[PDB]
Each structure stands twice: as C-alpha cells, then as structure tokens.
Amino acid sequence: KFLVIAGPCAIESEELLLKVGEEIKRLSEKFKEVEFVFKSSFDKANRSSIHSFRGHGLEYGVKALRKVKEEFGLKITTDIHESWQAEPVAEVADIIQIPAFLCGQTDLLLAAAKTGRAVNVKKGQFLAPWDTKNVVEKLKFGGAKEIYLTERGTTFGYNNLVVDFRSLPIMKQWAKVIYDATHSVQLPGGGMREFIFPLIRAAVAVGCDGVFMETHPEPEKALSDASTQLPLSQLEGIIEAILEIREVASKYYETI
Amino acid sequence: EKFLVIAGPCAIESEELLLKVGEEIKRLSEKFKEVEFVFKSSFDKANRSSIHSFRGHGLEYGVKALRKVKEEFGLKITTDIHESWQAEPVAEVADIIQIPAFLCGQTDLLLAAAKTGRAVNVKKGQFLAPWDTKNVVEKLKFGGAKEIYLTERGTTFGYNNLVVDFRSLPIMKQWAKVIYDATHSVQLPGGGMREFIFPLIRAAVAVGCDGVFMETHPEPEKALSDASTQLPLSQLEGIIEAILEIREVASKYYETI
Amino acid sequence: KFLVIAGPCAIESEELLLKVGEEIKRLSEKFKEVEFVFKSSFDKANRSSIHSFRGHGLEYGVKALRKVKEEFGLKITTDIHESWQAEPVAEVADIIQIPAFLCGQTDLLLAAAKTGRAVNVKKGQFLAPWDTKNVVEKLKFGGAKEIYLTERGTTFGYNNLVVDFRSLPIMKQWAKVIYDATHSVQLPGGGMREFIFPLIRAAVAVGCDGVFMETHPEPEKALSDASTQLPLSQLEGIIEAILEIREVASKYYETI
Amino acid sequence: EKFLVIAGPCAIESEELLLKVGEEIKRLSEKFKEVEFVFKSSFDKANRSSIHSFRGHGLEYGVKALRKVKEEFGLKITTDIHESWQAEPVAEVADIIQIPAFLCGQTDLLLAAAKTGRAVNVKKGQFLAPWDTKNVVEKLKFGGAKEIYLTERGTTFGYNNLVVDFRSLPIMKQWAKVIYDATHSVQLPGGGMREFIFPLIRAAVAVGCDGVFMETHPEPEKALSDASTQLPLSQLEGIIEAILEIREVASKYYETI
Numbered sequence A, C: 001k002f003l004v005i006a007g008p009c010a011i012e013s014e015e016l017l018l019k020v021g022e023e024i025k026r027l028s029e030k031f032k033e034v035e036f037v038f039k040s041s042f043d044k045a046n047r048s049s050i051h052s053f054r055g056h057g058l059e060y061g062v063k064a065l066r067k068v069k070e071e072f073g074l075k076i077t078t079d080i081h082e083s084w085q086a087e088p089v090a091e092v093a094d095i096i097q098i099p100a101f102l103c104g105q106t107d108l109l110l111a112a113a114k115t116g117r118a119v120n121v122k123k124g125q126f127l128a129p130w131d132t133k134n135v136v137e138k139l140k141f142g143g144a145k146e147i148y149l150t151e152r153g154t155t156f157g158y159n160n161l162v163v164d165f166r167s168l169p170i171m172k173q174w175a176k177v178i179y180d181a182t183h184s185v186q187l188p189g190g191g192m193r194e195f196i197f198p199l200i201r202a203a204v205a206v207g208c209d210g211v212f213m214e215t216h217p218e219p220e221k222a223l224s225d226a227s228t229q230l231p232l233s234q235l236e237g238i239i240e241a242i243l244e245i246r247e248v249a250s251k252y253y254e255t256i
Numbered sequence B, D: 001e002k003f004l005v006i007a008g009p010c011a012i013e014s015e016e017l018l019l020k021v022g023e024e025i026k027r028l029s030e031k032f033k034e035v036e037f038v039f040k041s042s043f044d045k046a047n048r049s050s051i052h053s054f055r056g057h058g059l060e061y062g063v064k065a066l067r068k069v070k071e072e073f074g075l076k077i078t079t080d081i082h083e084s085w086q087a088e089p090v091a092e093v094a095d096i097i098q099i100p101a102f103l104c105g106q107t108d109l110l111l112a113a114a115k116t117g118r119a120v121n122v123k124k125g126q127f128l129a130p131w132d133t134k135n136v137v138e139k140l141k142f143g144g145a146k147e148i149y150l151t152e153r154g155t156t157f158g159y160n161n162l163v164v165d166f167r168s169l170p171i172m173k174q175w176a177k178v179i180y181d182a183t184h185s186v187q188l189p190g191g192g193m194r195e196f197i198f199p200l201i202r203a204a205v206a207v208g209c210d211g212v213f214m215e216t217h218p219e220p221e222k223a224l225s226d227a228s229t230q231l232p233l234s235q236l237e238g239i240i241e242a243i244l245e246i247r248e249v250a251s252k253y254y255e256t257i
C-alpha cells in the first residue's frame, strides 16, 4: 500500500500526540488504500542552538507513542540517534528512522537492523542518490528486511536545499522510496511552506512509495520546525490530491 | 488555458529533417486541439563545446527552412538568436524569439527581440536564481515585449551537472508564463540523461507550468547535436498525452499567483 | 612577467580613467617586474536592471582608453560583447577580454582571435575547469597566440560564488591563468570586500600568472560594482604583498 | 603563536604503523620547534561507504596504541569519537577530542567531549555554512570546553565532490581557532585528488589559519583507509617547511578578527 508517514515533529506532549493521532486515525479510516504511520521525535538531537527545545526524553517519548498505537491502532515510527536507543525504541516503533546526518553511521544502522523492525533512512544532504546502495547493503547485512530511503533535499550552496527528483527512480533500484515533503523545503541554519504542496505533487507524479509529512494543529506554536509543519486541517486535502495524481500518473511509472 | 508545447529537432540539419518532424507535429496538433504547438529548431548552435561540432547552415538557410515548415503545416515557429542584428531577420518567420540561457542577461539582445513585436521566450541561465528573472522580464517589458515566457532548463549543480529546482516554477510564474525544458534540464554540460526526461516532465506538469519544451528527432542517435537527449519522434504523442492527463488531474490544485 | 590587470570597472569618464591611470603608471614604475595592464569596460552589457548604468558607448570608450595608453604608455584591455566590436576595440586593446557569460560564444571568440591581439577569457560561472580546454582550442583555431583564462568564481547555490582553487593548476595546462580578485567574491543578483585580499593571497600561494583587480578612487561612488572595487590607495600595498608571497611560494609551484 | 600541525595515519592499522609514523613526527617536532605537533589516528572508521571496508581494531586497542605513542615520543594525541559514551575513555589519552564532520551538530556528542576538560576539534560538516559554526562553538562553551577548534574540510559541491570555500577561514576565526584539513578537502566522497593537497594547503596558510591537519602514511597505496589522499610520510617534512615559509611571509597581512 502507498505510505503516508505523518505526525508532529517533536513529542511536545502526549496530549499533542493524541490530538494529531485522532485525525490521522480518521484519515486512516477514510483512505483504506493507504498505510498511515504515526511519526514523532522523542528528541531533537541536533538543534542549531543549545537553548532550543530537544524534548522530554526517550522513556516519556516511547510511552506517549505507545499510547498512540494503543488508543488508535496506528503503526509507529520515530528516529534514533545513538546505537543503544534502537532496542528500547523498537518495542513500540514499527519503523525505525535513521536521521539524515547519521545515514552513514554503520553502528546505528546495524543496531536498527538487529531489532527486526523496518528501517527508514533519511538520505543525507551530502549524499548522492547512487551512494545509497551501500546504505541499503549495510542494513541487509545487519538482517534488515523492510528498507526505505527517504528523499529530503540536497545541499545547494549555503542554507538551502534543492530536491533532485532524479533521485526517486535511482533509489528505487534498491529500496522503497519515501518523499519527505516537510524538510525538503526548509532552509538549513525560499518561502518554505508555500513549496510543500507543489513539490509533493511532483514527487507522486514522478513516482514514489510513500510520502512523509510533519503536521501540527497549530504549526505557529510548534516547539520544533514551526515554519514548515503542515496545519493538521490541511492534511486530508493534500492526501486526497496525491492519491488522485498518483492514480493517473502511476500508469507511467517506469519499471524498476 | 491553452497549454504550450514547443518541439522540434535541436538543429536545422536540413530542410528535409524539418518537414519530417513538422508533419508529425502537425498531426499531433490536429489531435491535441487543447494544445498550442510551436515548431522549434536552431539555425545555429553558437556555443558548442568544440570548434569541430556541427553549428548549422546559416541564418538565411534556417529561416527559409523554418518558413517552409510554417507554410506547409501552418505551424507557429520559434528559434533562438545570438546577437542583436539577428532579431529583425528572424522575426520575419518566428512567432516566438528565443533567448539562449547564457545570454539571458544581455540587455541589447533582449531589447532587440522585444522591439520586433514578437513573443519572447528566455531560457533561464544555469547561473540565475529564480527570483532574479524578475529584472529580465522588466527589461523585456521596457523594450516593448507584450508576450513573455521564462524557460526552466536546470541550474549549475557542481561540475558537469544540472539540477531542476522545481520551486522555480511558481516563483517565475509571478512575472511571466513558465515553460519547462524537458531536454536540456537532464543534460550533463561538458545523474544520467534520457531516462530522466519523462519523469521530470511529469513533475513539471504536477507542479504547474504553462508549457513544455522538448527536442525530438526521427533518429536521435544520428542527430548532429544533443543526440543523447533528443526524444525519438515516435515517443512524442505518448509523452504529450501523459502530460495533458497529469496536468488535468493536478490542475485543481495549482496555487494562485 | 607577472601580470596585474587593474582599473575602474566602467569607463565612467575619461577623467576617472586618467586619474586611475596615473596611479597605475606610478606603480608600473615602482614594480618593473610586473606587467601592468589598464582595464575598463566601455559597456556594462548585463546589468541586472534596465535602469542601471551601462556606459557612454564604444567610440567614447575606445577614445578614453586611447588617451590612457597615450598619456601613460600603459597596455590596455577591455571586454567585447558582440562580434562586430572586436575590430574597433582591437585598435586600442592589447588584450581583448571575453565576458564570463559569453565564454562559450564561438563567433565572439573567433572575432577576438582574428584581430591578432591577446585574448583573455573569463571562465563562466557554469564552466568546469577542464572544460576550458575547448575554449582555448577555439581561440587557437581562430589564430590566437597569447591566451589567458581568468578564474572568477563558480555558481554555488543561488546568489553566491565559490572559488575552487583547484582550477588554477588545471587551467594552467593549456593557458596562462589569471585570478580575478574582484568578481570572485561578489554575490550575483558574504561580506564581499573583506574577502578580496585573503583570496588574492591564496591565488598567488597556489600559483597563477597574474591577478585582475578593479579599483576606484572612491569605490563608494562607482557607477558599477561599487561594493567590490578596491580603493585606489590600497592597490600598492596589495601588489607588494602578492609579490612577496609569490617570491616565497613560487619555489613550490608544481610543474605545468 | 605556535602553529598546530595535526598529523598521522588515517586509521590505527596496528600499533606498529603508529610507532613508525610517530617516530617521524617526533623527529619533525624536534626540528620545527615553532610548531605544536599532535599525533592523530582513528580507532574506528564509523562511516565507511561499504560494510566491507576496514573499520579498526576497537576502542580499547586504539587508545592503548595511542597511549604507547604518547608514552614513547611524548607527543600530544587526538582521535575522534562517534557516540557519547566514548568521550570518557578516549579522554584518558587524547589531548584533543575530535568530532567527525557528519556529527558536528549532535549536541550530546559535543557536550560529552566538552565535559572531559580536553580540547575539542570539530570538523565542519560538508553541509554546514561557515557562519553556522557559531552555534556549534556556543554548545561547546556551554558544555565546559575552554579550548576549541573548527576544522575546514570542504563543502558539498554537486555530487561526489567537495570544494573549499576559503572565505570560511576568516569567518570561523571570529569564534574559534581554525584548522585546515589538507587531506579530506580534496577527497571525492563516494577535481582529482592527491595532486591538489599541496596547492590547497598553500592557499590555507596564505589566507591564514591556526593549524593544518594532514593524514600521512609510510605507504599510502597500502593504507586500509584513504589510501588515495594520505600523504607519503617522506613528504611531510617538505610540506611543513613550505607552509611555515608561506605563513611567515603572508602573516603580516593576516586581517584582525
């Protein structure tokens, strides 16, 4: 099934997670052809500033994600930052997410694969599409079976990311490909939000196995990625649109 | 609104090659009535990498060949100019005067095209930020151009590589109609190539543009220029049908500028 | 001899040219080991804005440059923008300059070579160093004998240029290499001026055949490139510095 | 001020390789008394492209080998950490804890290095703008680091290529001492390579930095990692003499931060 990974950027509170989870559950009931995966980070490990919000800890995070999976029966995904976190997180995460900056850390990938869960690696901003082949192989070596590669932009000069859509067909040669519509338009360190929907449309017209989107009831108040999180109320309309585009465009997806 | 499809062989190899592609384009224009087709071919490749590559058969010959195409098929014409003096003679036959990517900033060339009264299509330089096309349009308006197009053809990304930053489509749409060049955007000046033409063109129409530009040739492998990226003529119909379908389903979601 | 190409960006007036020419003449007398070339554009053919200063015309420009060469006996260089301008300009220009954006225009290069003068091509911002081989060959084909390639930065994301110093040894394989210290730090369309001297030092430590620098009595009032033109009073100090660095570093210039 | 030269084999292939390079570095430290030499070698290559490449002989083995070097030659030591828990044991022997380029933003790793009391050298990420290293330094100061270095090792430039934007040297100098990594800056992740090490290092000292980082190996072609860019041990002396000479003549022109 087509994948839609969505949720608030950071686990600001179990409350926020349950509110977003409700809406995702509802959409889950509405779009049965789509496999929804609830996503949220228990820790923002590389905020620019030491004074910025990181989170409430792994334990509290796994707990809240457990509440979401229990209350709504939704699959879960969260990102790990050091090898030791793989196991505890795998208790609740159906898919373990590997941060873009850490996509080359062999030990992190192996610890993810060992848990037996699915692994979704965010393609580093410094990484060429063809060089993700080795990332996938490390994971296979470590016993991984369900492997995803997520396109999230590429370093383009300073404080800018460009999305090279040629990467989708290239990465598809060795893994299921996910398009990160949120982080692909943010400026590291223009007008971010206005480009999220247009690029999402491009991703499905080109061909991918799923889309990743951060969403918040009130993006304006988000403690992380405030400028790019999609207002929860707009999620349905966007999903309906990509399914329609996908339905027509899929006829032309090149074999691979 | 009528979607624009600019297509044709990269270079005017002969009047014969032109009439051949022209006939196929004429046929598709009869089928895709919702599309405005414009026949394209350069009378001169003014910046081949090597001094030993094919340039063309001259301005006079090119214009005459292009005139034959318009005459025989009733097709609109577009070709590119390389120096100011060429605008006048070229405007005799060209409905749209094209400005090469490297020359998108040359004021005199822009003014020369503008005062002919013809439409003007500027290829966005590989070095140019989407927001900096605003002044290129201003120059044209200042020069008398009433119909202006900006063509997305990729941006310098490291050495011998171009990337297409699709954010440029809605940015440039603020001041001109936008065309997506499906051929030159996948070329490696000096990823691979042809295998990416179709997927990137699908992305372009999903994002939203006013037209697409595609070089096509009966036998790409024998073309005297851009043999690697020129689309096989027989594949044109399918590509066009596909983009009209994607455009239609995506259209209700195009943002308002 | 080591080359130093300097002068005001645009021929704002014969007056300005003579004032800058005087100082350049003086430095010419002071640094006999250096071949000074007076540079100034009779036309700024690609200003961002239609309302910006372009110049006073080719005729007036060639006239003023003639006054400089006559009054101070300094060699001359100016840039052409269309093929027809090569011949009239070659009457006074010892070196014909090919704009960076036009470095691939075969007809412009051939018209430059035909005049018999020296040709200095500004490496396009889109051009890889190894791809300048073909530029040089076009010129040789057209009869050019004294050929220079000028490093002036490379497109690095939007509105930014980076200087890849690997380009100097690479281009030296087929032409004399000049480093443009002025345009290499400007932001197309950070803090420009503060980086001019540091990068100039790098260029000579690496190894080049000359340096290109725009200078103005009062950069602040320049009608073109106001933010990057070097104050005339600082030129001597910079030249003395690059000669000293060159004297020590030249011992290590790799053979080629 | 004492110029820093950080050098050594890329990976701790064996305690024997270490003592060999160590002896040469000890010898140069006796000749170049105006230089502070720091012996470098990774106990682990935590991010080889392939799962089949050499990683190392483990933390315990590495630290012990590095300790032997410090013990036998009285040389300062530096090595890189990959996870927070490694900072403490590594600080036992390392005078400078190095933070890998890809991890330059990992707050916990930075804090872990900072609280050891050792000096900290951060490799500037290939994705990081020079001005964004300011917050990396802030994190370290916050964590207790009193001696901080930022290492220039190139920036992503298209695919499989890095460019060195020398404007970064004076920018980063605003908040930390700066080191130029002569080895990794010419590497093509995943121009050519070794032929550019020396020229770029000359540019670095002409611009101005507080030290240079260079991987050297008795026989580069046999190294288990970075064989292509590791400098032949016999060439180290000459490279160092050359940069001290260029540094000296350029020094009076170094701008004040």
Ligand SMILES: O=P(O)(O)OC[C@@H](O)[C@@H](O)[C@H](O)CO
Residues within 6 Å of the ligand: B045, B047, B048, B049, B050, B053, B100, B101, B184, B187, B190, B225, B226
């Ligand atoms: O094939 P070479 O000779 O490199 O030429 C490339 C160009 O002619 C052409 O693709 C470019 O679009 C022209 O501006």
Ligand SMILES: O=P(O)(O)OC[C@@H](O)[C@@H](O)[C@H](O)CO
Residues within 6 Å of the ligand: D045, D047, D048, D049, D050, D053, D100, D101, D184, D187, D190, D225, D226
């Ligand atoms: O040679 P491969 O396996 O590609 O590895 C590159 C890296 O180990 C190394 O050069 C990089 O500096 C490590 O961070």
